[model samples]
Target chain A: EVEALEAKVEALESKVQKLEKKVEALEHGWD
Target chain B: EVEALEAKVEALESKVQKLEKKVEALEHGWD
Candidate 1:
């Protein structure tokens, strides 16, 4: 149960990280 | 260009918010 929960959290964390980078790129008007 | 960027940013922002809420709930062990 704990492992499953941790995996889910990790997945969400990855998405957040990707989105953060996207936000940065958009904010800087990069291409 | 600005409009497109803003739209993209908003989409990512929404995902971040949803993920944040999921994280919060998971942290509390709500399942």
Candidate 2:
């Protein structure tokens, strides 16, 4: 059950992660 | 961008909401 949902969760996770990464990178200045 | 993020979206959100997960586990199996 968690397996199937994991993909969906992971997809959502990646989307959120991308946004976070961008915000973090900008917040921390170019590195 | 929170609740509206899910209610307006078909995207499943089981982070903490029951939306459909029995709405609430009810403590003991007294559903």
Candidate 3:
């Protein structure tokens, strides 16, 4: 289902945001 | 284009992988 796939994509986007934030904090021990 | 969208999805997946690896190392300062 394309709809399901799109939902996954959106979830992936959310996942990316959280992980990116985590990386930013951890990567440098936070600014 | 669904195909192009799929390409973006694949790229997003790749993006997720890189960021996930980065987060893992930074979050715990790497095992």
Candidate 4:
């Protein structure tokens, strides 16, 4: 159960990382 | 310009937080 939850959290964190990249792009575009 | 970028970044972070909550719900449902 804990392992499965950890996997799910990791996937969510991966998604956040991708979105963070896009946010960084927007930040650069603003400059 | 910096303020605008900061606002955008904050909004994106908020979105990620919301998504994180949803992901947690999904994980709970999976159990």
Q: Tens digit of lDDT per residue, candidate 4, span A1-31?
A: 4555456557657878866665665557644
Lowest summed lDDT window (length 10), candidate 2 chain A: A1-10
Per-residue C-alpha lDDT of model 3 across residues A1-31, encoded as one tens digit per residue: 5786698699898998888677666657666
RMSD of each: 17.7, 16.3, 2.5, 15.1
DockQ of each: 0.08, 0.03, 0.58, 0.06
Query: Judged by DockQ cut-offs, is candidate 2 incorrect, acceptable, medium or high?
Result: incorrect
Where does model 1 exceed 4 Å of error?
A: B1-31
Q: Give lDDT tens digits, candidate 4, residues B1-31.
A: 6556556555756788886666566445655
TM-score of each: 0.49, 0.37, 0.70, 0.48
The better candidate by lDDT, 1 or 2, is: 1
User: Candidate 4, after superposition: displacement of residue B18 in Å?
Assistant: 0.3
Model 3 agreement with the true structure over B1-31: per-residue lDDT tens digits: 8777878888888888887776677566666
What tens digits encode model 2's per-residue C-alpha lDDT throughout B1-31? 4444445333444442342233223222455
Give the per-residue lDDT of model 1 (tens digit) for A1-31.
4555456566657878866666565558666
Candidate 4, residue B19: Cα displacement in angstroms equals 0.2
lDDT at B17 for candidate 4? 80
Q: Which has the better TM-score: candidate 3, or candidate 4? A: 3
Please list all clashing residue pairs in model 4, or write none if there are none: none
> Could you give the CAPRI-style class of model 4?
incorrect
> Which scores higher on TM-score, 1 or 2?
1
